Amino acid sequence: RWRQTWSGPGTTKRFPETVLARCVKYTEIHPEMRHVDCQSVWDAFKGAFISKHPCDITEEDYQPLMKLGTQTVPCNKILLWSRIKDLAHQFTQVQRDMFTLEDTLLGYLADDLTWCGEFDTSKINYQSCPDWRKDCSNNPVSVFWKTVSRRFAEAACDVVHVMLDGSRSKIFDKDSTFGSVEVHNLQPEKVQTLEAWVIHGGREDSRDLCQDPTIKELESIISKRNIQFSCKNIYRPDKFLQCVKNPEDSSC
Ligand SMILES: NC(=O)c1cccnc1
Numbered sequence: 001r002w003r004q005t006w007s008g009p010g011t012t013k014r015f016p017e018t019v020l021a022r023c024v025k026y027t028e029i030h031p032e033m034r035h036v037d038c039q040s041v042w043d044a045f046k047g048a049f050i051s052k053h054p055c056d057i058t059e060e061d062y063q064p065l066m067k068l069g070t071q072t073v074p075c076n077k078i079l080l081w082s083r084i085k086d087l088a089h090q091f092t093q094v095q096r097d098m099f100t101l102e103d104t105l106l107g108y109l110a111d112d113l114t115w116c117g118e119f120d121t122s123k124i125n126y127q128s129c130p131d132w133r134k135d136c137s138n139n140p141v142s143v144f145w146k147t148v149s150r151r152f153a154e155a156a157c158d159v160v161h162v163m164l165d166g167s168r169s170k171i172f173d174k175d176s177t178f179g180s181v182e183v184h185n186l187q188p189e190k191v192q193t194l195e196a197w198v199i200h201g202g203r204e205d206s207r208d209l210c211q212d213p214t215i216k217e218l219e220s221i222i223s224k225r226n227i228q229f230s231c232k233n234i235y236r237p238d239k240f241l242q243c244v245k246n247p248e249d250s251s252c
Contacts (some may be wrong), residue, residue, distance in 0.1 A: 055136035167201020
């Protein structure tokens with residue numbers, strides 16, 4: 001058909017099967033989640049959006065899934081990221097020095113997936129789903145990520161790290177999930193410091209991006225919440241990952 005209802009991509013092909021499968025795999029690997037019933041997880045995930053108008057999703061819709069996906073994350077080892085998930089993931093994969101949202105059951109289930117349903121039918125919409133900008137912010141995908149992201153930020157303590165994309169126009173973007181949700185849900189009673197790692201995208205020798213106006217903005221926001229701010233440049237992400245893998249081994 002030549003014109004879709006919504007402006008965004010439709011539900012990921014075989015979404016139910018993919019989510020169920022990711023749940024078996026995750027619960028086989030992670031012993032703390034070995035007992036989770038993946039049929040129940042899928043049913044709760046479905047219940048959040050099936051038969052519901054995809055511009056009228058609320059955080060409450062996902063509460064059954066959140067309950068089933070309850071999981072302890074080492075609070076002092078969280079790695080947040082904004083628009084730079086690949087390096088964050090590559091980094092935590094080496095020796096599990098830190099945990100991203102996609103290291104948790106719920107983040108792992110949804111990563112890279114899209115999904116929505118229809119008001120008053122129980123079908124999944126594989127043709128289109130609302131675009132956050134053009135159609136509506138209260139859509140199944142956006143609401144899921146906001147809900148799980150807030151919970152993840154709330155879980156953090158001590159020193160929390162964030163990888164930021166230093167090749168971007170706004171290295172810290174207040175409109176990102178990091179900037180709009182996570183910064184504001186770190187608990188100052190528990191979180192001592194937010195340390196940003198600004199990942200360079202530019203070959204070799206470049207600026208001190210910790211002096212970027214948007215980084216100063218982030219510092220000001222965090223500092224005014226009574227959390228300390230630290231920042232480091234990662235000039236060569238390739239060298240960084242090499243050093244994580246083989247530390248002291250070379251010129252690290
Ligand atoms: N894994 C993701 O795509 C994602 C998107 C937004 C917030 N958190 C995680």
